[PDB]
């Protein structure tokens, strides 16, 4: 329903690619404000897990964020008749294991994080640029869950390719922590620039989906140390997971844009 509305202050397109290797295949929801562009371009938040970040984009939240700077969105989904796919998103949201592939979880390939991130930078940007001016220098990543994961690896292993990172409840779990070795490193690739990482964790979810928040407290209270980057941990009461997604996104339009 929210892509065919024409009552609000965004209205929404389609931008479709397939994968470099031809086996998955994106559709991108680009929601543009009517309001005209900053001279420098809208700043853009891109969400990971487009056809459920769609879903959580309620209209009172979209009203407002038209306030004279709003943002260009761009929620990244696959292009198949479920609007899903398993396949797909497990294998662009995991990174590879140097060392070993195939997923703890569901056991199906993963490891295509760098190439759905260069693939992002080398064929969704130009897309989405093409239709609406951006500034680059004002770009945010969102996800959650294994969503969160790729976020996390985005900024662990190639700090800089956006100004805010935000990931909700991000798989810490996954490959028994391997997410958190990748962070080691990361004041060194920070050197000579900012970035700010936003997380969130409901109360009520647990540490794996087979002791919780333990993980995500040390984890905060490693990156509350790290040089150039800004950390903002906000812990979501009477949540549990899935209800994280559509909260996170709320919360994170809500707040002040990229500077
Ligand atoms: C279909 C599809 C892809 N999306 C999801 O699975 C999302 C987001 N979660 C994830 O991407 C990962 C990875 N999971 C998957 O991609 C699909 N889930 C499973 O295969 C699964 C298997 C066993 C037990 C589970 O809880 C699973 O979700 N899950 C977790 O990090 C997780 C952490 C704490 C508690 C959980 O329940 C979590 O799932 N999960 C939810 O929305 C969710 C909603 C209600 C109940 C759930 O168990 C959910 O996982
Ligand atoms: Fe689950």
Known sequence: SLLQRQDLPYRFSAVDLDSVDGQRHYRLWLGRPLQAPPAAGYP??????????????????????????????????????????????????????????????????????????????????????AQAPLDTARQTLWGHAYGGLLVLHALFTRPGEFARYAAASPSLW???????????????????????????????????????????????????RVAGLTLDFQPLDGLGHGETLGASLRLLLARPAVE
């Open 174 to 224: 996954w490959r028994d922590g391997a997410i958190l070795g990748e962070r080691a490193g990361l004041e060194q690739r920070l050197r000579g620039k900012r970035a700010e990482l936003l997380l969130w964790r409901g109360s009520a979810e647990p540490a794996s989906p087979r002791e919780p928040g333990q993980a995500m407290a040390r984890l905060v209270d490693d990156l509350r």
């Open 44 to 129: 853009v938040v891109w969400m990971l897990d487009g056809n459920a970040a769609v879903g959580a984009l309620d209209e009172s939240t979209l009203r407002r964020l038209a306030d004279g700077d709003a943002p260009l969105l761009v929620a990244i989904g696959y292009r198949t008749p479920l609007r899903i796919d398993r396949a797909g998103r497990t294998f662009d949201y995991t990174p590879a294991s140097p060392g070993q592939q195939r997923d703890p979880l569901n056991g199906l390939p993963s490891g295509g994080a760098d190439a759905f991130l260069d693939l992002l930078r080398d064929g969704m940007r130009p897309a989405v640029a």
